[PDB]
Amino acid sequence: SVLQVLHIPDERLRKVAKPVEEVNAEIQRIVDDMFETMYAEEGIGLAATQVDIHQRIIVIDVSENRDERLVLINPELLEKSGETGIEEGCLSIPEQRALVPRAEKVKIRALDRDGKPFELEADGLLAICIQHEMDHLVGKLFMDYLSPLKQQRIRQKVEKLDRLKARA
Ligand code: NI
């Protein structure tokens, strides 16, 4: 099932997620529907909290033909180094992109879809993507990194967009 993605300025985007207590079949259905929603919305990553589920689950897939789907449950940042930034988009901030400071490399520890633990050293797009999604889980958005004026300037935009969007 395709889940509905919340947009700013929805207050539920600012909720802190709780860790997953047990990775079971309800968890695994959330994963499936999250992947479905991400692909439908043409993203390369989705955090559970953008879909009003306030648990620590992230799905990513950067692959061309769904060969390499990635699942981080209860993710934890072990180390980072460097600094970079591309012009990020966010499914919850529709059509708005900004360059954002990130660590260039990142080492994490998480659980997979089966609740088995793994480690992952990432760089490039993957590293930036992990940070972006992990931010979602503590209620941070990429626009939080920008100046009051850019944020202000941004917010105006999106509300109009959706104000078109329901359209009716
Ligand atoms: Ni996002």
Swiss-Prot record:
Q: Where is the active site?
A: 133
Query: What catalytic reaction does the record list?
Result: N-terminal N-formyl-L-methionyl-[peptide] + H2O = N-terminal L-methionyl-[peptide] + formate
| Entry-linked InterPro entries | Peptide_deformylase, Peptide_deformylase_sf
Ways its activity is controlled:
Inhibited by 1,10-phenanthroline.
- UniProt xrefs under Gene3D superfamilies: Peptide deformylase
- How, per the record, is the cofactor bound? Upon overproduction is isolated with 1 Fe(2+) ion per monomer, a Ni(2+)-bound form is as active while a Zn(2+)-bound form is inactive.
| Needed co-factor(s) | Fe(2+); Zn(2+)
Class of this enzyme:
hydrolase
Could you name the domain of life of the organism this protein comes from? Bacteria
Stated EC number for the protein is: 3.5.1.88
Q: Which GO terms describe its cellular component?
A: cytosol
**One GO biological process from the UniProt record?**
translation
What keywords tag this UniProt record? Answer: Hydrolase, Iron, Metal-binding, Protein biosynthesis, Zinc
Instruction: Kindly list the GO molecular function terms attached to this UniProt entry.
Output: ferrous iron binding; hydrolase activity; peptide deformylase activity; ribosome binding; zinc ion binding
Record has Nucleus as a keyword: no
Name the residues that bind Fe cation: 90, 132, 136
Is Iron included in the keywords of this UniProt record? yes
Function comment: Removes the formyl group from the N-terminal Met of newly synthesized proteins. Requires at least a dipeptide for an efficient rate of reaction. N-terminal L-methionine is a prerequisite for activity but the enzyme has broad specificity at other positions.
> What does the record note on quaternary structure?
Monomer.
**Family per UniProt?**
Belongs to the polypeptide deformylase family.
Protein name (record): Peptide deformylase
